[PDB]
Design a protein around this motif. Structure first.
Motif, PDB file in Angstrom:
ATOM      1  N   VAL B  27      34.176 -32.304  65.271  1.00  0.00           N
ATOM      2  CA  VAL B  27      34.795 -33.284  66.154  1.00  0.00           C
ATOM      3  C   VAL B  27      33.848 -34.444  66.300  1.00  0.00           C
ATOM      4  CG1 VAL B  27      36.238 -31.713  67.376  1.00  0.00           C
ATOM      5  CG2 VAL B  27      33.939 -32.045  68.174  1.00  0.00           C
ATOM      6  N   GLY B  28      34.392 -35.632  66.509  1.00  0.00           N
ATOM      7  CA  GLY B  28      33.513 -36.769  66.616  1.00  0.00           C
ATOM      8  C   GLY B  28      34.186 -37.950  67.258  1.00  0.00           C
ATOM      9  N   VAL B  48      42.315 -37.136  67.920  1.00  0.00           N
ATOM     10  CA  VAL B  48      42.339 -36.408  69.202  1.00  0.00           C
ATOM     11  C   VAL B  48      42.745 -37.318  70.367  1.00  0.00           C
ATOM     12  CG1 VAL B  48      40.930 -35.115  70.892  1.00  0.00           C
ATOM     13  CG2 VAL B  48      40.703 -34.710  68.382  1.00  0.00           C
ATOM     14  N   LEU B  90      39.235 -35.008  64.968  1.00  0.00           N
ATOM     15  CA  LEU B  90      38.904 -33.656  64.511  1.00  0.00           C
ATOM     16  C   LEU B  90      39.046 -33.687  63.006  1.00  0.00           C
ATOM     17  CD1 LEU B  90      38.580 -30.604  65.371  1.00  0.00           C
ATOM     18  CD2 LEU B  90      41.022 -30.449  65.060  1.00  0.00           C
TER      19      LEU B  90
END
Lengths: 94, 94
Positions: B27-28, B48, B90
């Motif tokens: 995730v980022g 997301v 994601l």
């Protein structure tokens, strides 16, 4: 307009915070374990991928929230989480 | 069973990598900008919170994917992203 990095619980929980349309948001990862978090403003937690098992203060039961599900945590409170498998989450103050 | 931290593009993109049921996931967050990423194995990107505007190699057009939407990026390739507002994503190899 930067991405704020935080680590908690000896690296058990890490997060990336950011502003989006003026609003503070964070995404993060939790490794398997049990953790207690305190709330000031209310929070809305969303499970991005995985599951979080939640017990808010005073609650008799644990509730499992899986990918795509959200739960609100009243402010001025705390909540416990059990993490069975490494899980990504999203947190807003909304 | 750890959470791997990475930063890219002078802090423009940061990610948290982790295993979930044997599978690598990350995730980022991406700050506003334009970025080029290369693929080896195919990837599935999920927005997301926010939006990513995507052009895969050879594509004539950009396509905006918003919160909850996913897109696949074939392997052995590359793709460009425009980010208009700071956005969480994601990434899976699934």
């Amino acid at each position: 307009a930067s991405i704020k990095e935080n680590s908690y619980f000896a690296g058990g929980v890490k997060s990336l915070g950011f502003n989006q349309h003026g609003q503070d948001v964070s995404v993060g990862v939790m490794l398997p374990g049990e953790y207690t978090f305190g709330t000031q403003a209310p929070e809305r937690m969303t499970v991005v991928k995985g599951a979080l098992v939640v017990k808010r203060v005073g609650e008799a039961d644990w509730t499992t929230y899986s990918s795509g599900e959200s739960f609100d945590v009243e402010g001025n409170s705390s909540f416990e989480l059990q993490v069975k498998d490494a899980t990504a989450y999203l947190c807003e103050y909304l």
